[PDB]
Design an enzyme around this catalytic site. Structure first.
Site, short mmCIF file in Angstrom:
data_model
loop_
_atom_site.label_atom_id
_atom_site.label_comp_id
_atom_site.label_asym_id
_atom_site.label_seq_id
_atom_site.Cartn_x
_atom_site.Cartn_y
_atom_site.Cartn_z
N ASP A 4 0.91 -1.13 0.00
CA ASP A 4 0.00 0.00 0.00
C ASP A 4 0.96 1.20 0.00
O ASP A 4 1.41 1.60 1.07
CB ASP A 4 -0.76 0.06 1.30
CG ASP A 4 -1.58 1.34 1.31
OD1 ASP A 4 -1.35 2.18 0.40
OD2 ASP A 4 -2.42 1.44 2.20
N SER A 29 0.39 10.75 -17.23
CA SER A 29 -1.05 11.11 -17.23
C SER A 29 -1.12 12.47 -17.88
O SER A 29 -0.24 13.26 -17.57
CB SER A 29 -1.47 11.07 -15.78
OG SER A 29 -2.69 11.73 -15.49
N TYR A 44 -6.52 16.77 -8.86
CA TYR A 44 -5.97 15.62 -9.57
C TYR A 44 -4.81 16.13 -10.43
O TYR A 44 -3.71 15.59 -10.48
CB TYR A 44 -7.06 15.03 -10.51
CG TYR A 44 -6.50 14.05 -11.53
CD1 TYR A 44 -6.00 12.83 -11.07
CD2 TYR A 44 -6.43 14.25 -12.88
CE1 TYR A 44 -5.45 11.91 -11.92
CE2 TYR A 44 -5.87 13.34 -13.75
CZ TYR A 44 -5.37 12.16 -13.28
OH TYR A 44 -4.79 11.17 -14.09
N1 LIG Z 1 -7.17 5.27 -16.68
C1 LIG Z 1 -6.70 6.29 -17.40
O1 LIG Z 1 -7.35 6.69 -18.36
C2 LIG Z 1 -5.37 6.95 -17.00
C3 LIG Z 1 -4.87 8.03 -17.74
C4 LIG Z 1 -3.67 8.66 -17.38
C5 LIG Z 1 -3.00 8.21 -16.27
N2 LIG Z 1 -3.47 7.16 -15.49
C6 LIG Z 1 -2.72 6.68 -14.31
O2 LIG Z 1 -2.42 5.29 -14.36
C7 LIG Z 1 -2.46 4.71 -13.02
C8 LIG Z 1 -3.86 4.16 -12.79
O3 LIG Z 1 -3.95 2.96 -13.54
P1 LIG Z 1 -5.42 2.57 -14.07
O4 LIG Z 1 -5.86 3.55 -15.06
O5 LIG Z 1 -5.32 1.13 -14.41
O6 LIG Z 1 -6.36 2.67 -12.75
P2 LIG Z 1 -7.18 1.51 -11.94
O7 LIG Z 1 -7.56 0.55 -13.01
O8 LIG Z 1 -8.10 2.05 -10.97
O9 LIG Z 1 -5.87 0.79 -11.27
C9 LIG Z 1 -4.98 1.47 -10.37
C10 LIG Z 1 -4.36 0.51 -9.36
O10 LIG Z 1 -3.84 1.37 -8.33
C11 LIG Z 1 -4.13 0.76 -7.07
N3 LIG Z 1 -3.98 1.60 -5.87
C12 LIG Z 1 -4.80 2.56 -5.41
N4 LIG Z 1 -4.39 3.01 -4.23
C13 LIG Z 1 -3.30 2.31 -3.94
C14 LIG Z 1 -2.40 2.32 -2.86
N5 LIG Z 1 -2.61 3.16 -1.88
N6 LIG Z 1 -1.35 1.49 -2.86
C15 LIG Z 1 -1.15 0.62 -3.87
N7 LIG Z 1 -1.98 0.59 -4.90
C16 LIG Z 1 -3.03 1.41 -4.96
C17 LIG Z 1 -5.48 0.09 -7.26
O11 LIG Z 1 -5.76 -0.93 -6.31
P3 LIG Z 1 -7.08 -0.95 -5.72
O12 LIG Z 1 -8.01 -1.21 -6.76
O13 LIG Z 1 -7.10 -2.03 -4.76
O14 LIG Z 1 -7.43 0.22 -5.00
C18 LIG Z 1 -5.31 -0.47 -8.66
O15 LIG Z 1 -4.64 -1.75 -8.52
C19 LIG Z 1 -2.35 6.02 -12.14
O16 LIG Z 1 -1.03 6.47 -12.44
C20 LIG Z 1 -3.38 6.81 -12.95
O17 LIG Z 1 -3.39 8.12 -12.49
C21 LIG Z 1 -4.64 6.52 -15.92
C1 LIG Z 2 -7.57 13.63 -17.32
C2 LIG Z 2 -7.13 12.98 -18.64
C3 LIG Z 2 -6.55 13.95 -19.62
C4 LIG Z 2 -7.20 14.24 -20.98
C5 LIG Z 2 -8.66 13.86 -21.18
C6 LIG Z 2 -9.45 14.99 -21.81
C7 LIG Z 2 -8.86 15.94 -22.67
C8 LIG Z 2 -9.60 16.97 -23.26
C9 LIG Z 2 -10.94 17.08 -22.99
O1 LIG Z 2 -11.75 18.07 -23.53
C10 LIG Z 2 -11.60 16.17 -22.13
C11 LIG Z 2 -10.84 15.13 -21.55
C12 LIG Z 2 -11.57 14.19 -20.64
C13 LIG Z 2 -10.79 12.97 -20.18
C14 LIG Z 2 -9.30 13.22 -19.91
C15 LIG Z 2 -8.32 12.23 -19.31
C16 LIG Z 2 -8.61 11.11 -18.34
C17 LIG Z 2 -7.27 10.82 -17.58
C18 LIG Z 2 -6.25 11.78 -18.24
O2 LIG Z 2 -5.09 11.98 -17.44
#
Ligand SMILES: NC(=O)c1ccc[n+]([C@@H]2O[C@H](COP(=O)([O-])OP(=O)(O)OC[C@H]3O[C@@H](n4cnc5c(N)ncnc54)[C@H](OP(=O)(O)O)[C@@H]3O)[C@@H](O)[C@H]2O)c1
Ligand SMILES: C[C@]12CC[C@@H]3c4ccc(O)cc4CC[C@H]3[C@@H]1CC[C@@H]2O
Ligand SMILES: NC(=O)c1ccc[n+]([C@@H]2O[C@H](COP(=O)([O-])OP(=O)(O)OC[C@H]3O[C@@H](n4cnc5c(N)ncnc54)[C@H](OP(=O)(O)O)[C@@H]3O)[C@@H](O)[C@H]2O)c1
Ligand SMILES: C[C@]12CC[C@@H]3c4ccc(O)cc4CC[C@H]3[C@@H]1CC[C@@H]2O
Lengths: 280, 281
Positions: free
Chosen positions: A65, A142, A155
């Site tokens: 964690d 991200s 965020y």
């Molecule tokens: N999804 C997108 O569109 C997107 C876009 C840009 C960046 N990101 C980034 O990518 C990563 C998220 O991956 P994802 O999109 O696959 O999200 P997700 O499917 O919700 O998976 C994220 C993982 O992070 C874990 N987590 C949360 N709190 C934690 C903690 N305190 N310690 C250890 N693990 C923890 C979750 O476990 P639990 O489920 O048990 O809580 C889950 O295994 C973050 O860097 C997120 O900001 C995602």
């Molecule tokens: C916030 C993020 C950046 C860019 C994306 C975007 C970018 C432009 C916009 O008009 C709407 C959105 C909604 C969803 C967004 C994304 C989900 C995760 C990512 O990091």
């Protein structure tokens, strides 16, 4: 064995997919320590790994964690090779909402996991890579870390912080063998958004704007969101580089938006362009 | 007086100077509530207020510790005029040293004073501004907020967080008639650095060496390039003056060649090399 990798947050989305992608690599050169916040959620990971047929011992999961430094130490103590070649800082949460509506806990929580937690992993793990003068740190990029997005102020704040944190260390680490890289991503189909979530704490105009933002994000996420499998390939790309750059992008899509952001330090331009992109 | 300004971090450095510059304004248009994390250290504010002779009733200090929301509400409730025309979010902190050597409560305070602290200020002051359809929020920028500086890893994270928070809020506020601008500052002669640090135990010898190599360079840069707390204070005024103010105001062009350098390199390694060479030769 060989190439010990240690990834955080692998219950789902990105963690899970890069975990098994790495463990099932045809080269068979990666030992993968998929860590998760709570092991009881490891069903899917294992099922995926089992479904892919990974060399026995190529996958191991630990509980970690990232918001508890004791948890971090412990897992580190559980990496039997006594080394981590590839450290993956992948955990993180989103948080949506008019700034005046966000709560202290939510705020803190976001900062503690996204930023403070990467800090803990690195403190626990840079030392030995620095000392061994070898190591690769890959951090999940991200887009709301490269430019501000309405209603995702905290965020975004917590996501720009990782850039800053990462950018400082690469300036230093160059010389020590250790290389840090961020894999920058746009919307990705994970568990992310479903977890991310006013009337009484915001005023009528922000409220209606909120709802207008909301609707649009969801249509757009669905339209652009990439596969979590697309993203692991990028982490592989970077980690295959002989000399990895600091930024890897998972899609060219925000590139154009980024350049006009950078082409105007006053920021007036981006602000107008993003306001129109979001509220037409 | 009339424009009501509310500034955090006025026990010294930029807070202090912005607070008495505005209060001693010839126009005499501003009322200034200079808030202090601990009112007991306000003697220097007053002496300086006196030195520029702020007319009576032009300056009122208050206690506001950005780490505590009850402190924020209270300050807010002591703004007799019941409105804030300009909100200057200035309190901020530095932290310097090998990442691995930094203490967990250190890393946390830096993020809570700098990042959560501005999130607490805005949450409290913004709403009414939005109701009014008028207001100007100025946030002390920082160049460690625009590009990464070695051994300052958490300071930089907290500083890139104010950019994402203010830019994110700026896209929204655009049409509300509420103006948020960052006064981006390079080095300045304030108390900031006396408190940043003063390692061997907590880090390797190799890193230890670079650390000193960095202190050599930064000290030189502060020495040969810092600006005055008052040079800086003229920028918040320029910024508060413009009828249509931008998101950023730079108090210096100095790191603008280095800013562009970064700007024209998405992959981020050109800047990393330059910065690397530029600090550890
Ligand atoms: N999804 C997108 O569109 C997107 C876009 C840009 C960046 N990101 C980034 O990518 C990563 C998220 O991956 P994802 O999109 O696959 O999200 P997700 O499917 O919700 O998976 C994220 C993982 O992070 C874990 N987590 C949360 N709190 C934690 C903690 N305190 N310690 C250890 N693990 C923890 C979750 O476990 P639990 O489920 O048990 O809580 C889950 O295994 C973050 O860097 C997120 O900001 C995602
Ligand atoms: C916030 C993020 C950046 C860019 C994306 C975007 C970018 C432009 C916009 O008009 C709407 C959105 C909604 C969803 C967004 C994304 C989900 C995760 C990512 O990091
Ligand atoms: N100095 C520079 O070179 C430089 C460069 C770029 C940006 N900045 C920024 O500008 C701001 C002002 O710092 P400075 O340079 O003026 O140095 P400074 O003199 O140290 O300014 C700090 C002031 O803010 C206060 N503060 C600290 N923690 C607080 C808290 N929790 N609640 C309320 N107030 C708190 C300090 O209080 P105490 O006196 O009681 O500690 C002090 O009054 C910071 O954001 C800093 O990052 C400065
Ligand atoms: C980033 C700051 C301005 C740029 C300064 C700098 C810039 C370049 C450099 O090589 C060293 C330093 C030392 C500390 C820095 C400062 C600490 C606070 C301020 O925000």
């Amino acid at each position: 064995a060989r190439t010990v990798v240690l990834i955080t947050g692998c219950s789902s989305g990105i963690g899970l997919h890069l975990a098994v992608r790495l463990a099932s690599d045809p080269s068979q050169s990666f030992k993968v320590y998929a860590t998760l916040r709570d092991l009881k959620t490891q069903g899917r990971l294992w099922e995926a790994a089992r479904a892919l047929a990974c060399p026995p011992g190529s996958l191991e999961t630990l509980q970690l964690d990232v918001r508890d430094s004791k948890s971090v130490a412990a897992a580190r103590e559980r990496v039997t090779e006594g080394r981590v070649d590839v450290l993956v800082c992948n955990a993180g949460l989103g948080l949506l909402g008019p700034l005046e509506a966000l709560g202290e806990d939510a705020v803190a929580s976001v900062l503690d996991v996204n930023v403070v937690g990467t800090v803990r992993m690195l403190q626990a793990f840079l030392p030995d890579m620095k000392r061994r003068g070898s190591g690769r740190v890959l951090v999940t990029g991200s887009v709301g870390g490269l430019m501000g997005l309405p209603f995702n102020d905290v965020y975004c704040a917590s996501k720009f912080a990782l850039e800053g944190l990462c950018e400082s260390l690469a300036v230093l680490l160059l010389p020590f063998g250790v290389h840090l890289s961020l894999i920058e991503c746009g919307p990705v189909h994970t568990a992310f958004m479903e977890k991310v979530l006013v009337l009484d704490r915001t005023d009528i105009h922000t409220f209606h704007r909120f709802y207008q933002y909301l609707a649009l994000s969801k249509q757009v996420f669905r339209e652009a969101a990439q596969n979590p499998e697309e993203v692991a390939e990028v982490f592989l790309t970077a980690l295959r580089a002989p000399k990895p750059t600091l930024r890897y992008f998972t899609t060219e899509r925000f590139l154009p938006l980024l350049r006009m952001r950078l082409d105007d330090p006053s920021g007036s331009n981006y602000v107008t362009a993003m306001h129109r992109e979001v509220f037409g």
